[PDB]
């Protein structure tokens, strides 16, 4: 109930400042608005670093706390893949203080955030499952993931050449008409794709002239025009009568 | 005069920053190492509203620095991080700042494929400082 | 000026006096004690850490009790604290032994408090870094008052000096408020002795003395750690 | 940074610092002395050396080990001369001890009675701080054997194992780890730990002759200094 | 640099006194204190130096000091030099009762303290004393007698005082008040609150504060009133009331 858990962190809100000293309230205040607002897909990389603020204030805890800890700020780094963040974290003695098995599994599962790969990717995915039950949104963080990898795919095989047959082309992304040529369609919306393609013969074409200097410094500047004369006829009917 | 010019210079700076506000557009970020030269006006109120000290590192940034230096290190380690955060935090402050480059500076004494433990706790030991001082102040 | 000169004390141009002043701010540079009036009992918690580990705090003892009633804890400098023990060891027992019986501690502080009062007041060549908690247990009210080098005598239900002088202070300011519970009272100020306190914590790291209405108890660091870190 | 008599007077600094007491201590870094108190399960073992520029010198009057009882010894460190001015003292406010209470002092509160006027030595400027250091041992009944050390700022300090002065400073960074271990010690491991500790202080290990090793353990409790004969001994032992 | 050494023993250069010019500097430093003149008894108040409500308060009375049980007195300034002050004049009351089995008259006795305040004044070297402390009684020939100590060696005793340097706004007020044979004690009661709620600087005479301490003549007990903070809360209510009552007019 993600309502029901704003309103319990509304009650936080007021309640950390209420008595004296939180003692850790925004600690946890800040990683609360690092958990409903990741359901809220406010931002990425500054919900990460809620969890990172969130780690800074979880030295000297319950390490069964810790230990399970990691396993949101570092899945975390899986969902985004371009916290750029990266390199500061992982590199620090605070990040690498836990020598522990399951914070092993997961110094490579941070490693993984480095890796991408597909093929990679698909294969850890096995292995890496017993961290796929503790990710607090299943959906979501590896729906973007894919999806992001997905058009991360496509514009490798598409670059090389500059039209390429659909029939093929989608039996190494298993299917075409379903979704995967819609979502396609959807990148020429999105302007990340620039192409057609051509349902009779099954080839994908692209083509591009985007910029035109003669018509849009023109045309902009004769609507422009027609507000100079506009403006001025104040001028031209108040002076006759 | 070259120098009564120049600080002309500096208070022709310090008028152009009245002709700004209010109020776009303009950022300027200063710092200097003394405080007492500094001309009235430059401080006075209606050009700088806002000045925040550098606070003086103390213990809080060593354990800061000493994370960012050991982050840089390739680990590797061959070097104990325990020690160091307790008889050299005795003698740390200071030890500010470039100081713990030379004791990065004093690692190029090896001749050794990671520089030795010794090496690092050289330049601590030394300062060429205190006294003894703590306990024996107490004394 | 100047213009005070010395004998007994130094001089500012302002307030307060000079010199001495200096040894003032080694006080707050000194060991920081925590103390605790609490119902029908004082507690007292020290914080004594040594350099090296090559050292057993089974030797030295920072608390010193003078009467077996009265214990005493020090927040300031060294033996110039020593040196008021075996001082009040026969200040104490003198007036003790005067009228044969201990006599309720508010005149314990007043006659102890005296010649310690000139003694830190008076010209000691150097100055005296050395300030107390003074303690004690009179007529079913225990009492516990805060001295220093300025021979200004306080009365506290929770008081801190040296470290945690600022932090502490205020803390207790305003978590505790009047008289609350006794064990209660303890857990606050052990709280706020724990907030600019080193994250390792040990049975040597500190100490804690405690003035029972049927005399003063020393405690060791075996039952210290055996209590509650969070003692309460 | 100075301000008024504050450099003559032992008053402290804006910042709280003393000035003539903070002199003082590496008064004895000049001395140019070593000794390390190291104590072990049921003894202690002091560590000493002394220096012979001429042939002249002789060996009864420049050792520095100074006995105070027959069961209590002493070692000093720095300058010599203000140091047997508190031998004397010792063995004076020990025998009030005697005297008095009429039993054997504990050594502990010697070393507080000692600190106490050595506070006050530190208390006028008018009487030199008298930068003479002390170290002393003993033994008290069923506590085993003890150490103990004073500098001339004023407090009394022992522990199980604790060394203070020019070059001490890197014998007890060695001995953290070389003494534990922390176990039954046997008299030849005692002395094996005296010269290690020197070893890595100094590396000459030169000729057992101008060392100095005392010894306090309890078969019978009277202190002892070890003979020339059997510190050769156990120097060859330990070398092998 | 004719002044600018230390000196304390002899005085300055033009015939000012050197140290006492810096004595009363002092005085002038967190003092507090009044006093008015009163028909069959005498009042005076008080000021607690910390508003902590912590405080134990089992000092009782602090800034006011009983030397005697028909006489007391009120310290301003430092706390700690003042104590070797109190027992001092509380023996020398107490060995000049022993001597004539008869209270000790308050005339000789200030001028006595007084004369021990000024040989650490004079000679030695010796560091003045920085402390103010009033005295108030009653005595078989004038009556009630009111006195003020000085360091200087001449006391500042009148029938009013000022305490401290702060208290100056009061002394224009205690001269346009100032009355001869009405008392009704409670008629400068009530004007000392309007001294403490506008010419000190806390307003609203916070009890816990302060201290009132009053001494009513009786044959022969000459009781000494602590009061302290009891009916302070309704004098409170009182001076308020009267503030409620002076603005219906306008």
């Not at chain 4, 002091?46 to 010894?73: A, C, M, R, Y």
Request: with cysteine; glycine share 6%.
């Amino acid at each position: 109930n993600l309502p029901k858990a704003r309103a319990a962190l509304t009650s936080a809100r007021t309640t950390a400042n209420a008595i004296y000293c939180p003692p850790k309230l925004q600690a946890t205040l800040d990683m609360q608005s690092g958990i409903i607002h990741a359901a809220e897909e406010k931002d990425w990389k500054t919900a990460y670093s809620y969890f990172y603020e969130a780690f800074e204030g979880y030295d000297s805890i319950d390490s069964p706390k810790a230990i399970t800890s990691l396993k949101y700020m570092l899945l975390c780094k899986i969902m985004l893949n371009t916290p750029e963040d990266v390199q500061a974290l992982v590199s620090g003695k605070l990040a690498l203080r836990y020598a522990g098995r399951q914070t092993e599994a997961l110094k490579c599962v941070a490693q993984a955030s480095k890796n991408r790969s597909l093929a990679d990717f698909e294969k850890a995915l096995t292995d890496y499952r017993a961290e796929l039950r503790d990710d607090p949104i299943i959906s979501t963080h590896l729906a973007k993931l894919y999806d992001n990898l997905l058009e991360q795919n496509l514009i490798r095989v598409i670059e090389p050449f500059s039209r390429v047959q659909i029939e093929h082309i989608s039996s190494l992304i298993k299917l075409s008409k379903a979704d995967v040529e819609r979502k396609l369609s959807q990148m020429i919306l999105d302007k990340k794709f620039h192409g057609i393609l051509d349902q009779g013969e099954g080839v994908l074409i692209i083509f591009d002239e985007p910029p035109v200097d003669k018509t849009y410094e023109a045309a902009l500047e004769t609507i422009q025009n027609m507000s100079k004369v506009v403006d001025s006829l104040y001028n031209k009917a108040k002076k006759l009568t | 005069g070259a120098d009564r010019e120049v600080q002309r210079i500096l208070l022709e700076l310090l008028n152009q920053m009245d002709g700004f506000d209010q109020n776009v557009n303009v950022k300027v970020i200063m710092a200097t190492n003394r405080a007492d030269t500094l001309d009235p006006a430059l401080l006075r109120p209606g050009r700088l509203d806002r000045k925040i000290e550098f606070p003086l590192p103390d213990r809080r940034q060593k354990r800061l620095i000493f994370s960012t230096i050991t982050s840089k290190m390739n680990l590797s380690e061959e070097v104990d991080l325990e020690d160091y955060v307790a008889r050299p935090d005795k003698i740390s402050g200071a030890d500010i700042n470039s100081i713990c480059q030379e004791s990065g500076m004093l690692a190029v004494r090896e001749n050794r494929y990671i520089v030795l433990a010794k090496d690092f706790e050289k330049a601590y030991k030394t300062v060429i400082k205190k006294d003894e001082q703590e306990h024996e102040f107490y004394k | 000026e100047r213009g005070y000169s010395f004998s007994l004390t130094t001089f500012s141009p302002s307030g307060k006096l000079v010199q001495i002043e200096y040894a003032l701010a080694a006080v707050a540079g000194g060991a920081p004690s925590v103390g605790i009036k609490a119902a029908n009992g004082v507690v007292l918690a020290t914080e004594k850490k040594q350099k090296s580990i090559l050292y057993d705090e089974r030797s030295v003892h920072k608390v010193e009790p003078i009467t077996k009633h009265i214990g005493l804890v020090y927040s300031g400098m060294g033996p110039d604290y020593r040196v008021l023990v075996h001082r009040a060891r026969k200040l104490a027992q003198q007036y003790y032994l005067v009228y044969q019986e201990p006599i309720p501690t508010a005149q314990l502080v007043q006659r102890v408090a005296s010649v310690m009062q000139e003694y830190t007041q008076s010209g000691g060549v150097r100055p005296f870094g050395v300030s107390l908690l003074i303690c004690g247990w009179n007529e079913g009210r225990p009492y516990l008052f805060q001295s220093d080098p300025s021979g200004a005598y306080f009365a506290w239900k929770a008081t801190a000096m040296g470290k945690n002088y600022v932090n502490g202070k205020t803390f207790l300011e305003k978590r505790y408020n009047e008289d609350l519970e006794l064990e209660d009272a303890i857990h606050t100020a052990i709280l706020t002795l724990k907030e600019s306190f080193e994250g390792q914590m040990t049975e040597d790291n500190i100490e804690v003395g405690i003035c029972n209405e049927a005399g003063f108890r020393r405690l060791t660091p075996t039952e210290v750690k055996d209590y509650l870190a969070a003692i309460a | 940074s100075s301000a008024g008599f504050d450099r003559h007077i032992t008053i402290f600094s804006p910042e709280g610092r003393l000035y003539q007491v903070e002199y003082a201590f590496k008064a004895i870094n000049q001395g140019g002395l070593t000794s390390v108190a190291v104590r072990g399960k049921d003894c202690a073992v002091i560590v000493t050396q002394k220096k012979v520029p001429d042939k002249l010198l002789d060996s009864s009057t420049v050792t520095h080990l100074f006995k105070i009882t027959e069961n209590i010894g002493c070692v000093m460190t720095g300058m010599t001369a203000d140091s047997r001015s508190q031998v004397q003292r010792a063995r004076y406010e020990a025998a009030n001890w005697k005297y008095k209470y009429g039993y054997e002092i504990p050594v502990d509160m010697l070393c507080k009675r000692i600190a106490d006027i050595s506070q006050v030595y530190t208390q006028n400027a008018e009487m030199r701080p008298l930068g003479c250091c002390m170290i002393l041992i003993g033994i008290d009944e069923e506590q085993g054997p003890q150490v103990y050390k004073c500098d001339p700022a004023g407090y009394y300090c022992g522990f199980k194992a604790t060394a203070a002065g020019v070059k001490q400073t890197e014998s007890t960074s060695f001995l953290e780890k070389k003494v534990k271990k922390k176990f039954d010690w046997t008299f030849e491991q005692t002395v094996e730990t005296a010269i290690t500790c020197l070893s890595t202080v100094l590396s000459i290990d030169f000729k057992p002759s101008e060392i100095e090793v005392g010894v306090v353990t309890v078969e019978n409790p009277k202190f002892r200094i070890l003979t020339e004969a059997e510190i050769d001994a156990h120097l060859v032992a330990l070398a092998e | 640099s004719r002044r600018y050494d230390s000196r304390t023993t002899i005085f300055s250069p033009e015939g000012r006194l050197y140290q006492v010019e810096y004595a009363m500097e002092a005085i002038g430093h967190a003092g507090t204190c009044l006093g008015i003149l009163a028909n069959d008894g005498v009042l005076l108040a008080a000021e607690r130096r910390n508003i902590h409500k912590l405080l134990d308060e089992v000092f009782f009375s602090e800034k006011i000091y009983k030397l005697n049980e028909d006489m007391a007195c009120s310290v301003a300034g430092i706390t700690s030099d003042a104590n070797v002050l109190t027992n001092e004049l509380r023996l020398i009351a107490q060995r000049y009762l022993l001597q004539y089995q008869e209270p000790i008259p308050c005339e000789q006795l200030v001028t006595a303290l007084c004369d021990i305040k000024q040989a650490y004044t004079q000679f030695g070297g010796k560091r003045p004393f920085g402390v103010s402390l009033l005295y108030i009684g009653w005595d078989k020939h004038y009556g009630f007698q009111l006195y003020q100590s000085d360091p200087s060696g001449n006391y500042g005793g009148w029938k009013a005082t000022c305490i401290g340097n702060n208290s100056a706004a009061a002394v224009s007020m205690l001269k346009q008040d100032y009355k001869e044979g009405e008392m009704t004690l409670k008629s400068a009661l009530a004007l000392a609150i309007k001294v403490l709620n506008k010419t000190m600087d806390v307003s609203k005479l916070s009890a816990e504060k302060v201290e009132i301490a009053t001494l009513t003549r009786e044959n022969g007990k000459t009781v000494i009133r602590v009061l302290k903070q009891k009916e302070v809360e309704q004098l409170i209510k009182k001076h308020e009331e009267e503030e409620a009552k002076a603005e219906r007019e306008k």
